[PDB]
Amino acid sequence: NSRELLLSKYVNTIKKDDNSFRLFHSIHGGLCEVDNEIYKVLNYLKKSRLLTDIYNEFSYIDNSEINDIVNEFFEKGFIIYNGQNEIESYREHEKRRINRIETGEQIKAIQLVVSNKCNYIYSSKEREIYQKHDKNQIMTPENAINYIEKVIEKIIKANNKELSIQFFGGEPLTNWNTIERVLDHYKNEDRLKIDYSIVTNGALITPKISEYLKKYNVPVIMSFDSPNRSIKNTIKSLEILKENNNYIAFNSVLSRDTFDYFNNDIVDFAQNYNVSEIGILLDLNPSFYKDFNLDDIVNKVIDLYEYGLDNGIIVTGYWHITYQNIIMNKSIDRGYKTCSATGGQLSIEPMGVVFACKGSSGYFGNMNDLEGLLSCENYIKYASRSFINSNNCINCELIGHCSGLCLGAIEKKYGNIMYMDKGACDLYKLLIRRLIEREKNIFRYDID
Ligand code: SF4
Ligand code: SF4
């Protein structure tokens, strides 16, 4: 709280031209563009300055304008008091969250694995055991409601006001009975707001199911990929969903296997069927980031993203959550960045066993002992790297925005969820940098 001021070392610069500098903070975000005069003021603060020194250094700018610039970028966290340790301040968020883990207030989401069957990777003992188990195949309505109720009772004691519940599987519509019973059971819930979603291949969608998903305002995330290496049934399901004005997203994979087939046609298809969003999942196999040219990966993502923007379709994915956090911070209040499995999610299997995520091998415990689940070492280990993935990340421009490569992938490759995958990191950094370079709706400060 002194008087000497300092440009934060976490402020990153992407120069667009000699009068345009795009700036963001590696922890906080705050993406914006500044003109040359404001950039000169910020850079003067690389050495600690008193405000009156900035006045005299410039002074061809009115003091009152210099004061406006300094105050705006202080509030953004781009200018700090000399001596402030910003990474220790960020890490305090992590330590506070770890210290309060027994409250359960960090639990924001249930991934409700209602079926492990599909219609007609892993690296732990517990996955082998329960993927096979005959009582872990179909979640009963009674067990589903009980599991959810245990979570709700815990988090409302922490005064949590919201909870997301994602119906997940194998193919969740193989267990519509349990989904429908859960929706009906909680229809009058008033202790907190429940938000639902469902991830499906959509093959089993009927007018009745579609009307019911709409009634409960359940966004439908449908797997879809362009022809590679069927579509009539996908069109049949989309036409049903669109008729009832359901919210539809596609989930598409950009991987070694889809790379040459991944193109912008999916946006034209989406617009035709009133699909609002297209999620792009980047390959979970780390060899993708060694074997494919990173600039070509980036261009495939950015081309789809920009053509989507031109067509009113939200092209998204974890990489886009990272980019949006760089514009407007939402991760601090959520307690996690793009991966909710770092303590924020309980992935509940039919027999009540609980993992970090269906994408992860991390076994937490069993819903018959939720307090034991939240106190166990594996749960603590996953929850402890939510804000800072690894000490690999401390000097990275994405530290406050990026969760690294999926837990399941680094579990398999390194046996260590703190071991960041360098190839994937390189891609993330290239992608975010290109998104910033190409942003058309940046907020720009001009000196006055
Ligand atoms: S995981 Fe990699 S890209 Fe992401 S913040 Fe850490 S070092 Fe940076
Ligand atoms: S563990 Fe993988 S699949 Fe699960 S939320 Fe994290 S990144 Fe996504």
- Tell me, letter by letter, the H, E, C secondary structure of the chain: CCCCEEECCCEEEEEEECCEEEEEECCCEEEEEECHHHHHHHHHCCCCECHHHHHHHCCCCCHHHHHHHHHHHHHCCCEEECCCCHHHHHHHHHHHHHHCHHHCCCCCEEEEEEECCCCCCCCCHHHHHHHHCHHHCECCHHHHHHHHHHHHHHHHHCCCCEEEEEEEECCHHHHHHHHHHHHHHCCCCCCCEEEEEEEECCCCCCHHHHHHHHHCCCCEEEECCCCCCCHHHHHHHHHHHHHCCCCEEEEEEECCCCHHHCCCHHHHHHHHCCCCEEEEEECCCCCHHHHCCHHHHHHHHHHHHHHHHHCCCEEECHHHHHHHHHHCCCHHHHCCCCCCCCCCEEEECCCCEEECCCCCCCEEEEHHHHHHHHHCHHHHHHHCCCCCCCHHHCCCCCCCCCCCCCHHHHHHHHCCCCCCCHHHHHHHHHHHHHHHHHCCCCCEECCC
Count Cα atoms within 13 angstroms, Cβ side, for 403: 28
> How many other C-beta atoms are found inside a 10 Å radius of the C-beta of residue 277?
19
Q: Whose CA is nearest to atom 6 of ligand 1?
A: 393
Domains recognised in the chain with CATH numbers: 5-84 (3.90.930.60), 96-383 (3.20.20.70)
Mention every residue, 6+ apart, whose C-beta is less than 8 A from residue 319.
280, 282, 301, 428, 431, 432
Q: Which of 200, 183, 184 is nearest to 248 (CA)?
A: 200
The bridge status of strand 193-200 relative to strand 29-34 is: unpaired
In this structure, are residues 110 and 198 in contact, taking their beta carbons and an 8 Å threshold? no
Count Cα atoms within 13 angstroms, Cβ side, for 354: 27
The bridge status of strand 363-366 relative to strand 353-355 is: antiparallel
Compute the distance between CA of residue 7 and CA of residue 261 in angstroms, rounded to an integer.
46
In angstroms, this model's resolution equals 1.7
Q: Which of 6, 10, 38 is nearest to 25 (CA)?
A: 10
The bridge status of strand 444-445 relative to strand 29-34 is: parallel
Compute the distance between CA of residue 389 and CA of residue 384 in angstroms, rounded to an integer.
9
In this structure, are residues 288 and 255 in contact, taking their beta carbons and an 8 Å threshold? yes
End-to-end CA distance of the chain: 28
Compute the distance between CA of residue 104 and CA of residue 151 in angstroms, rounded to an integer.
8
Compute the distance between CA of residue 139 and CA of residue 347 in angstroms, rounded to an integer.
13
Q: Which tokens belong to 316?
A: 């998204």
Q: Which tokens belong to 230?
A: 């069927």
Compute the distance between CA of residue 319 and CA of residue 425 in angstroms, rounded to an integer.
11
* Method by which the model was determined: X-ray
Compute the distance between CA of residue 109 and CA of residue 111 in angstroms, rounded to an integer.
6
| Residues pairing with 7 in the sheet | 79
Residue 381, burial from CB neighbour count under 10 angstroms (0-12, 13-18, 19+): middle
For ligand 1, residues with CB inside 6 Å are: 389, 392-393, 396, 398-399, 402, 404, 420, 425, 428-429
Compute the distance between CA of residue 429 and CA of residue 26 in angstroms, rounded to an integer.
11
Q: Is the CB of 357 under 6 A from ligand 2?
A: yes
| Residues pairing with 138 in the sheet | 115
Q: Is the CB of 424 under 6 A from ligand 2?
A: no
Ligand 1 centroid distance, CA of 397 (Å): 8
Q: Whose CA is nearest to atom 3 of ligand 2?
A: 359
Compute the distance between CA of residue 308 and CA of residue 193 in angstroms, rounded to an integer.
31
Q: Which tokens belong to 394?
A: 């401390």
In this structure, are residues 370 and 151 in contact, taking their beta carbons and an 8 Å threshold? yes
Count Cα atoms within 13 angstroms, Cβ side, for 383: 31
In one-letter notation, the amino acid at residue 289 is Y
